[PDB]
Amino acid sequence: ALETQKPNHLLEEALVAFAKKGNLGGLP
Numbered sequence: 001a002l003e004t005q006k007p008n009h010l011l012e013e014a015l016v017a018f019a020k021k022g023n024l025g026g027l028p
Helices: 009-022
Strands: none
Touching: none
């Protein structure tokens, strides 16, 4: 969407957003 810095960061942030919350008891 706006990968001007770090490619596919739009999707990874969403992935991390879940991790830094409760990624099935992983990546706290």
